[PDB]
Curated annotation (Swiss-Prot):
Quaternary data: The interleukin-15 receptor IL15R is a heterotrimer of IL15RA, IL2RB and IL2RG. IL15RA also self-associates. Interacts with SYK.
Reported tissue expression: Expressed in neutrophils (at protein level). Expressed in fetal brain with higher expression in the hippocampus and cerebellum than in cortex and thalamus. Higher levels of soluble sIL-15RA form in comparison with membrane-bound forms is present in all brain structures. Isoforms 1, 3, 4, 5, 6, 7, 8 and 9: Widely expressed.
Posttranslational modification: N-glycosylated and O-glycosylated.
Source species of the chain: Homo sapiens
Disulphide bond pairs: C3-C45, C29-C63
The encoding gene: IL15RA
Entire protein: shown range: 31 to 96 of 267
Lineage start: Eukaryota, Metazoa, Chordata, Craniata, Vertebrata
Compartments where found: Membrane; Nucleus membrane; Cell surface
Function text: High-affinity receptor for interleukin-15. Can signal both in cis and trans where IL15R from one subset of cells presents IL15 to neighboring IL2RG-expressing cells. In neutrophils, binds and activates kinase SYK in response to IL15 stimulation. In neutrophils, required for IL15-induced phagocytosis in a SYK-dependent manner. Expression of different isoforms may alter or interfere with signal transduction.
Domain of life: Eukaryota
Ranges of residues in domain Sushi: 1-65
The protein's name: Interleukin-15 receptor subunit alpha
Length: 66
């Protein structure tokens, strides 16, 4: 039980080599960028109780320098 590709964020990178059911990942930001005051980039493989496949939340993320 692996997940679909996490394709979100915008101003950030992630690496997760094999995914997993009920796995948490945070975005590394873009090259040097910081999370703005309050933004959360927690992409968690949450079981959507219908599709039987854990997908990757809805994280807003505002990675802006520095």
């Amino acid at each position: 039980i692996t997940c679909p590709p996490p394709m979100s964020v915008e101003h950030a990178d992630i690496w997760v080599k094999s995914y997993s059911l009920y796995s948490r990942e945070r975005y590394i930001c873009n090259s040097g960028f910081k999370r703005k005051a309050g933004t959360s980039s927690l992409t968690e493989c949450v079981l959507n109780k219908a599709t039987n496949v854990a997908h990757w939340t809805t994280p807003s993320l505002k990675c802006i320098r520095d």
